[PDB]
A paper describes a structure:
A rather recently identified group of PTLBs are the R-type “diffocins” from Clostridium difficile, which constitute the only Gram-positive R-type PTLBs known to date. All R-type PTLBs consist of an inner needle-like rigid tube surrounded by a contractile sheath. Binding triggers extensive conformational changes in the baseplate, accompanied by contraction of the sheath, which, due to extensive interactions, drives the rigid inner tube into the cell envelope. Here, we have determined the crystal structures and SAXS envelopes of the R-type diffocin tube and sheath protein CD1364 and CD1363 in their pre-assembled monomeric state.
The R-type diffocin sheath protein CD1363 crystallized in space group C121 with one molecule in the asymmetric unit. Because crystals of the labeled protein diffracted to higher resolution, the structure was refined against these data and the subsequent discussion refers to SeMet-labeled CD1363. In the crystal form discussed here, CD1363 is monomeric and comprises two domains. The domain arrangement is best described as a “Russian doll” system in which domain II (residues G26–S225; domain numbering according to Leiman and Shneider, 2012) is an insertion into domain I (residues G4–R25 and residues L226–I354). At the N-terminus, residues P6–A25 form a long α-helix that closely interacts with α-helices α9 and α10, which flank the central antiparallel three-stranded β-sheet. Similar mesh-like organizations have been found in several T6SSs, indicating that these interactions are likewise conserved in assembled R-type PTLBs. Interestingly, the C-terminus in monomeric CD1363 also forms a β-strand (β14) that hydrophobically interacts with residues of α9 and α10 as well as with the same residues from the neighboring β-strand (β13 in CD1363) as observed in the pyocin particle, albeit within the same chain.
Residue numbers in the entry: 4 to 354
Write the structure that this text describes.
């Protein structure tokens, strides 16, 4: 059939568990030394030229949760530099969560728009942990807890996003961060429970004092506008992470191995679909998703494409529409159910 595509899906299925348990974090830092990109897998890879402040943010991220973050991409830019430059740079780098400990309001707006663009236009499923940003979008995690006391130092809400990003990256796909305890935090500002429940339902990720310890109140992103196809499940950090790794894996094989290398006929689209479903069957075995995932030609997306090309669909059967030539375009629809979730999720894949 399509040997090169089956090989690629077989490799990714073999590592999806590992890659899910230990994510990658992009961190933009303001500093005068060690400019550019710094890959950091451990504390020893940290350039000694960075300020002790920046070194603390890096270490906060390495704590993780169940596991530590697989890798940190630390992009250093000079003060006064345009944030849009670090973002432009990261568009060709592989990461899961972006944070910026020293972001100002102007920076946050740029990242928010940037993240939304990558996810909904470029189809690059990345996320950001920002401080006090009403993102109303699954791609933005809105951490809002101020004056986080670790050891004998009070980190600001923006600073602590380094710890929050690492904690999420070090959490397996099968686990929530809801009520995860942060033993390194010894105090936080007093907060009425009414203010806490209100903030959560407004899309804020917060720390709370609960039964002597400090823990994450609920692992939610900033999404508050819900639809029939994008409902409560899309507010959940762990669910979005599951959808993102699956979408990324499928889109990567299609882009790397199919587009332009395989004739994009209906018969080859069917072979591709079968290959994608075989990958999903592997994820089903690995306990990421429930059984009975489906993948099909995205009928409404392909219909819209044909209409944009002036194709008249009035003589055409449903099968003829599915089989129609779409040049180098691929329109697929995947129906998956993440483990223990209450509803199926439709995943649109378009190249």
């Amino acid at each position: 059939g399509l040997p090169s595509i089956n090989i690629s899906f077989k490799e990714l299925a073999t590592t999806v568990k590992e890659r899910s348990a230990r994510g990658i974090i992009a961190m933009v830092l303001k500093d005068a030394k060690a400019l550019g990109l710094n890959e950091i897998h451990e504390k020893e890879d940290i350039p000694v030229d960075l300020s002790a402040e920046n070194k603390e943010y890096i270490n906060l991220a390495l704590m993780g949760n169940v596991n530590t973050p697989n890798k940190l991409l630390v992009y250093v830019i000079e003060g006064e530099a345009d944030i849009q430059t670090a973002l432009d740079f990261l568009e060709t780098k592989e990461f899961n969560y972006l944070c910026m400990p020293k972001a100002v309001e102007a920076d946050k707006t740029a990242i928010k728009n940037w993240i939304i663009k990558l996810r909904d236009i470029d189809k690059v499923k990345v996320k950001a942990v920002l401080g006090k940003v009403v993102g109303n979008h699954e791609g933005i995690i809105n951490f809002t807890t101020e004056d986080v006391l670790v050891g004998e130092k009070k980190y600001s809400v923006d600073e602590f996003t380094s710890r929050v990003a690492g904690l999420i990256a070090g959490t397996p796909l099968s686990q929530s961060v809801t009520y995860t305890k942060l033993s390194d935090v010894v105090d936080i500002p007093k907060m009425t429970k009414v203010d806490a429940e209100s903030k959560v339902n407004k899309g804020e990720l917060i720390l709370i004092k609960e039964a002597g310890a400090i823990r994450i109140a609920r692992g939610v992103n900033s999404l508050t506008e819900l639809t029939a196809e994008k409902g409560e499940m899309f507010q959940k950090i762990k669910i979005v992470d599951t959808l993102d790794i699956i979408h990324s894996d499928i889109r990567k094989v299609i882009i790397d191995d199919y587009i332009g290398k395989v004739t994009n006929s209906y018969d080859n689209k069917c072979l591709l679909i079968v290959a994608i479903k075989s990958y999903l069957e592997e994820l089903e075995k690995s306990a990421l998703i429930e059984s009975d995932s489906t993948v099909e030609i995205d009928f409404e997306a392909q219909k819209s494409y044909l209409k944009s090309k002036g194709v008249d669909l009035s003589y055409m059967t449903l099968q003829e529409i599915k089989e129609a030539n779409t040049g180098s375009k691929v329109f697929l629809k995947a129906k998956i159910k993440v483990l223990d979730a209450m509803e199926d999720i439709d995943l649109s894949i378009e190249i």
